[PDB]
Amino acid sequence: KLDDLHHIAISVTDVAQSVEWYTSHFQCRIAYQDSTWALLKFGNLSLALVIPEQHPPHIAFTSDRAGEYGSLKTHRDGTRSCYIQDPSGNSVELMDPTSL
Amino acid sequence: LKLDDLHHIAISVTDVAQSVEWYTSHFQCRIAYQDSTWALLKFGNLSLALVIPEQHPPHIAFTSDRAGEYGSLKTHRDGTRSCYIQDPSGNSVELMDPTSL
Ligand code: NI
Ligand code: NI
């Protein structure tokens, strides 16, 4: 039972400009969008386009042991996750599968 | 109608050996490939690549029925094919020919 990626947040310089580009190149759906970040649903996961000042980039995994690495925070959408960094300084989020 | 997939992500790390240890410790994932310049970790729904940026550039790869419409496809040693374009912010984007997978 391999852990899954849940979503990847990459830095962009202009959210509307990015959403225009990704949706014209890729078969995807705009799940959420304002002026500081956007979320694009793909078939196997979702891609957040983020202004790093407003929403830092990161990669999120599901983990049965997310709690063992940090205290789970509850988000407005009802899911639970915590953040850590890998040895390089990359932001890694561990989603609580039970909160999905 | 049918959504495209993210096929893999390659993120920059400072040290491939240590990064492999960390990810394989924190997550249920399989090492699929590894050298001193990069590694490929198999998760459930895609693969994660850990690259030294100066050897293998970080990028996100998507499967696309129209990959060849955006750039000339390149058959890689492993048989698969893909082009590389750039998003407005300069993020490297690889498009995979689904028939080559
Ligand atoms: Ni997140
Ligand atoms: Ni690639």
Which residue range(s) make up the domain with B21?
1-101
C-alpha B93 – ligand 2 centre gap (Å): 9
Neighbours of B24 (CB within 10 A): 14
A11, β-bridge pairs: A50
> CB-based contacts of A97: which residues, under 8 Å, 6+ apart?
A62, A63, A64, A66
| Cβ atoms B60, A18 nearer than 8 A | no
Number of domains in chain A: 1
Give the span between the Cα atoms of B31 and B42, in whole angstroms: 6
- Calculate the dihedral angle through the C-alpha atoms of B41, B34, A66, B13, rounding to the nearest 10 degrees: -110
DSSP letter at B55 equals T
State which amino acid sits at residue B62.
F
Give the span between the Cα atoms of B97 and B69, in whole angstroms: 11
Q: What are the structure tokens assigned to A13, written together?
A: 């310089």
Give the span between the Cα atoms of B96 and B60, in whole angstroms: 10
For position B44, which CATH number holds?
Answer: 3.10.180.10
Asked if the Cβ–Cβ distance from A8 to B9 is below 8 Å, we say yes
Resolution (A): 1.5
**Helix (H) or strand (E) run with residue B74 in it:** strand B74-75
Pairing of strands B59-63, A46-50: unpaired
Q: Which ligand is nearest to the CA of A8?
A: 1
Residues of chain B contacting residue A17, judged by C-beta atoms under 8 Å apart: 88
Give the span between the Cα atoms of A5 and B29, in whole angstroms: 11
Strands of A1-100 (E only): list them.
Answer: 5-11, 29-33, 37-41, 46-50, 58-62, 73-74, 80-85, 91-95
The radius of gyration computed from the CA coordinates of chain B, to the nearest angstrom, equals: 14
Residues of chain A contacting residue B42, judged by C-beta atoms under 8 Å apart: 2
| Cβ atoms A15, A51 nearer than 8 A | yes
Q: What are the structure tokens assigned to A3, written together?
A: 């852990």
The structure's method of determination equals: X-ray
A81, β-bridge pairs: A73, A95
